[PDB]
């Protein structure tokens, strides 16, 4: 019993965090095998950030202009290249703590754990969702760039996010580990702003299934809905469209609980209309959208 | 920017988690040097749990009654003893990944990270507070017993909690690593209930200071209160009394924001009475009480 925002155990990632310095700029890098990955803006001054030409900034650098520290130990850089918005530093030592890993690009609505780091030293771990507007609602201060997001499956770490910047609303933007930004954002100080965000409907439905599994049914009703009528209503509350794919993904939870997906949809419609009337669902007074169907299954009793 | 419930990185503790089996009962243990710590109820059958005589149940056990698995590797048990409600198994191998550590007992209102584990295998990490009623609002299924709570300072792990049981309301109870329970609970399956809980006032005020630091300001006011009048309100709404010590601990945040604690109390006083006026504070439609003043400073300025 209980239901918590739970992160993956972070130890496999902790052993990969290093500090990268170029000039007066320090941030975090990810040391896997003999490569360190970090945001390419490490090669920029503050002045450079308005209109950087990364090709021109990088060609002026030699390997020894990059200082990489792994705990107490300096790693020697013996090569560098840029891939999209990520700098890849070849080092002369393979990380002996490299876990089984892959690089994955996630889609909006997917969750991951973030290891927030400063000066190559891990500070804290929390769970995030990729918002529909391609931002994350993290907790990051100056010095956090190059902190990573990940999932773990068996003993395999799937890296999906690297932190690059803060937007004016206090949310965060970054790239996959191939250096491609999530969303329309750029590693340039421009007037970019987060789009108006929306609620991740499939996740809210998963979390309502979690509430049922943990023994709460107060919010159900005697109605059903068509998928189209559900979407017409939900969109009036700035909820994401629910697709047939989402309905399919919810099948196992439907089966475990005996509540048809469109019957849970009718429940959600009524919750948006009514509020909670002084009640809570899994300890929350609002509808939670940062647990995926997978996350509910992961955490909840299968009974 | 941003404000998130954050756990400590768990790697130092991951390297200490093992599986302990006695008969048909399997749960998690903590392997530090050549000793494995786990709940003593591992020595019980389901029948024994109704009215266990732990003294007798342990005397009847030998080293050979215990299996300890560290990953793929069986550790041989070469000694056993009990300290309060914790079983200590001496093993033939010192854990090479033992961190610098201490055992500390925490106070209600204090926070810690939990590494939730099953079959000696870490599955997830989250942040908890020790509630005033000495329970924790965790997330634990069968097989989680022996999962631990901890804080980290520099390179030193301070272990403060070991999971023992679930209560009927779905909250959790356990011990410090010396086997002393938090709260008026016993390791027997008999009728037990969480006391009516109360809200950790100093933590709510800390979180209101966090909201101000993150530019959430709407609940500030000109109008203020006394400690006495505030505490009359606190008592009405099942909040813990606010002490002068609490007021002192919040001093940094008072200074940073220009908002006196008793002015923030009047804000909180209005929120408990008048409510939240449709609104949210840091994305919450409840008053959050599981961030300490230290946790806010740690995350906002660090
Ligand atoms: O948002 C930030 N910074 C760093 C600002 C200083 O950037 C620099 C950059 C280079 C040298 C010295 C200083 C503050 C953060 C808070 C929490 N997370 S990152 N950055 C860093 C990268 C970036 C962009 F490419 C575009 C817009 C903003 C930003
Ligand atoms: O709450 C639990 N259990 C385990 C029940 C099986 O206990 C046993 C114990 C021994 C042998 C066979 C079976 C369910 C949990 C859910 C989430 N966290 S623990 N326990 C185990 C210990 C305990 C007490 F000392 C007093 C009351 C309840 C419990």
Q: Rounded to 10 degrees, what is the CA torsion of A204, A209, A210, A211?
A: 90
Please check whether residues A231 and A255 belong to one and the same domain. Answer: yes
From B156, B173, B197, give the residue that closes a domain: B197
Statement to judge: residues A285 and A202 lie in one domain? yes
Q: Are A240 and A132 in contact (CB under 8 A)?
A: yes
Alpha-carbon separation of residue A93 from A18, A76, A177, B252 (angstroms): 13, 8, 20, 45
Q: How many CA atoms lie within 13 A of A100 on its CB side?
A: 5
Instruction: Tell me the CA distances in angstroms from B78 to B41, B89, B178, one per residue in order.
Output: 20, 7, 20
A211 and A120 in a common domain: no
Domain coverage including residue B207: 198-301
| Structure determined by | X-ray
- SS3 call for A151: strand
Residues B5 and B104 in one domain: yes
Atom of ligand 1 nearest to the CA of A164: 22
Calpha distance A235→A242 (Å, rounded): 10
With b for 16 or more beta-carbon neighbours within 10 A and e for fewer, the B41-61 pattern comes to bbbbeeebeeebebeebbeee
Is B300 known to be catalytic?
no
Separation of alpha carbons B65 and B44, rounded Å: 12
Whether residue B99 contacts residue B156, with contact meaning beta carbons closer than 8 Å, is answered with yes
User: Active-site residue among B22, B38, B41, B246?
Assistant: B41
Active-site choice (A16, A22, A41, A163): A41
**Residues B247 and B264: beta-carbon distance below 8 Å:** no
What is the resolution of the experimental data for this entry, in Å? Answer: 1.4
Does residue B208 share a domain with residue B222? yes
Pairwise CB contact (< 8 Å): A2 & B299: no
Cα angle B109, B27, B131 (rounded to 5 degrees) comes to: 10
Protein residue with least CA distance to atom 6, ligand 1: A46
Q: Which residues contact A192 (CB under 8 A, 6 or more apart)?
A: A167, A173, A184, A185, A186
Number of domains in chain A: 3
Classify the C-alpha dihedral B257-B259-B261-B265 as positive or negative. Answer: negative
β-pairing verdict for A77-83 and B148-153: unpaired
> Measured from the CB, is residue A46 less than 6 Å from ligand 1?
yes
What is d(CA B261, CA B253) in angstroms, rounded to the nearest whole number?
9
- d(CA B174, CA A257) in angstroms, rounded, equals 31
Domain boundary among B76, B99, B122: B99
Based on the domain organization, do B145 and B229 belong to the same domain?
no
Contact A283 B125 (CB under 8 A): no
HEC secondary structure over A12-78: HHHCCEEEEEECCEEEEEEEECCEEEEEHHHHCCCHHHHCCCHHHHHHCCCHHHEEEEECCEEECEE
Q: Please check whether residues B238 and B111 belong to one and the same domain.
A: no
The answer on B166 and B147 residing in a single domain is: yes
Residues ≥6 apart with Cβ < 8 Å to B107: B130
On the CB side of A125, CA atoms within 13 Å amount to: 30
Give the CATH number of the domain where residue A154 resides: 2.40.10.10
Please state, in angstroms and rounded to a whole number, the distance separating the CA atoms of residues B286 and A224: 30
Q: Which of A7, A215, A284 sits opposite B7 (nearest CB)?
A: A7
Q: Rounded to 5 degrees, what angle do the CA atoms B282, B286, B289 make?
A: 85
Residues A254 and A132 in one domain: no
B-contacting residues in A 84-123 (Cβ below 8 Å): 115-116, 118, 122-123
């Amino acid at each position: 019993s209980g239901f918590r925002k739970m992160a993956f155990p972070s130890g496999k990632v902790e052993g990969c965090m290093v500090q990268v310095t170029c000039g007066t700029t320090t941030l975090n890098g990810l040391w896997l095998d003999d490569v360190v990955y970090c945001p390419r803006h490490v090669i920029c001054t503050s002045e450079d950030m308005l209109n950087p030409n990364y090709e021109d900034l990088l060609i002026r650098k030699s390997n020894h202009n990059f200082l990489v520290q792994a705990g107490n130990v300096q790693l020697r850089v013996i090569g560098h290249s840029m891939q999209n918005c990520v700098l890849k530093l070849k080092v002369d030592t393979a990380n002996p703590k490299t876990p089984k890993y892959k690089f994955v690009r996630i889609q909006p609505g997917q969750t991951f754990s973030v290891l927030a780091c400063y000066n190559g030293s891990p500070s804290g771990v929390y769970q995030c969702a990729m918002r529909p507007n391609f931002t994350i609602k993290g907790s990051f201060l100056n010095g956090s760039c190059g902190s990573v997001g990940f999932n773990i499956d068996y003993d395999c770490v799937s890296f999906c996010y690297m932190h690059h910047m803060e937007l004016p609303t206090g949310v965060h933007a970054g790239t996959d580990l191939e250096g491609n930004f999530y969303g329309p954002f750029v590693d340039r100080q421009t007037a970019q702003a987060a789009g108006t965000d929306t609620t991740i409907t499939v996740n809210v439905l998963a979390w309502l299934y979690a509430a049922v599994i943990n023994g709460d049914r107060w919010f159900l009703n005697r109605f059903t809905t068509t998928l189209n009528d559900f979407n017409l209503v939900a969109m009036k509350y700035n909820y994401e469209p629910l697709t047939q794919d989402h309905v399919d993904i919810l099948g196992p939870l439907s089966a475990q609980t005996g509540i048809a997906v469109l019957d849970m949809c009718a429940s959600l419609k009524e919750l948006l209309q009514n509020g909670m009337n002084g009640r809570t669902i899994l300890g929350s007074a609002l509808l939670e959208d940062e647990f995926t169907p997978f996350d509910v299954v992961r955490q909840c009793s299968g009974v």
